[PDB]
């Protein structure tokens with residue numbers, strides 16, 4: 001089997017991308033944030049504390065003839081930015097772009113933190129990291145991809161995120177028309193439950209390539225590119241007036257600047273992030289200070305190749321027995 005679904009930025013900054021997902025019978029379509037950095041499929045629901053719902057579409061398991069309570073199962077998750085959600089668990093039929101999994105764990109939120117309440121366009125998350133990170137207790141649950149994997153034509157999914165534009169998640173096949181050149185595959189460590197790999201280095205703008213190993217994760221659920229403070233400083237040093245602001249929470253730069261590109265290495269290949277992809281616009285409406293799309297990972301503990309990086313590439317998440325990641329230019 002295969003599936004293919006369009007993913008759409010939630011706003012003009014590409015802060016996150018949402019993909020329609022059919023849950024239950026008859027289908028209840030929710031727009032979920034596909035997150036290769038986590039492993040829970042959770043949704044706003046009829047059980048979510050009413051004061052914490054602000055315009056999201058909710059899943060109502062009582063209206064699904066295929067929903068079953070996963071008796072005694074609870075979940076609770078906290079994300080890298082401090083946001084969180086928790087609740088109980090149903091199993092139900094979940095379909096993405098024509099690909100159907102029966103008995104998928106659908107984690108129904110009883111509580112969500114403020115950032116989720118404020119994102120009226122995100123109805124939940126669909127985790128695509130390794131199932132070892134799934135938070136359901138006492139019986140850990142598999143991701144949608146893990147459940148679908150054996151049925152797929154090939155045990156892969158691909159992320160083709162757009163720049164200020166829709167993109168595509170495909171399951172079970174590689175769309176050879178969606179990228180230029182060849183896909184360079186690179187080894188993955190699953191030891192932390194992530195799509196964790198080692199970039200071979202970087203370049204800033206037209207500069208030469210700096211060969212250096214950068215261990216990080218391919219995370220569609222993170223907006224920005226988080227890299228070691230050394231690399232990030234070398235990038236922003238090329239932008240007149242750019243500096244790290246403690247009050248703002250990262251590097252800012254004059255909105256009057258044109259940004260240099262940033263290249264990252266995948267083996268001997270190179271992915272070039274255009275400078276415009278690193279511009280996240282005014283820190284507040286009307287400000288002439290703009291927020292940078294490349295930020296330091298120093299306080300995070302791990303480097304994160306988030307959407308800023310991934311949207312410059314066609315990315316293959318190869319879930320074969322030995323997982324790998326593929327990157328192609330596009």
Ligand SMILES: C#CCN(C)Cc1nc([C@]2(O)CN[C@@H](c3nc(-c4ccccc4N)no3)C2)cs1
Nearest residue numbers: 035037038079080081083115219221222300301
């Ligand atoms: C600090 C530290 C150490 N370590 C935990 C960092 C990591 N964090 C992650 C993520 O939790 C999983 N991929 C990212 C994500 N973020 C959101 C999100 C979407 C909407 C609103 C709020 C959100 N947080 N959805 O997915 C964050 C992976 S590694």
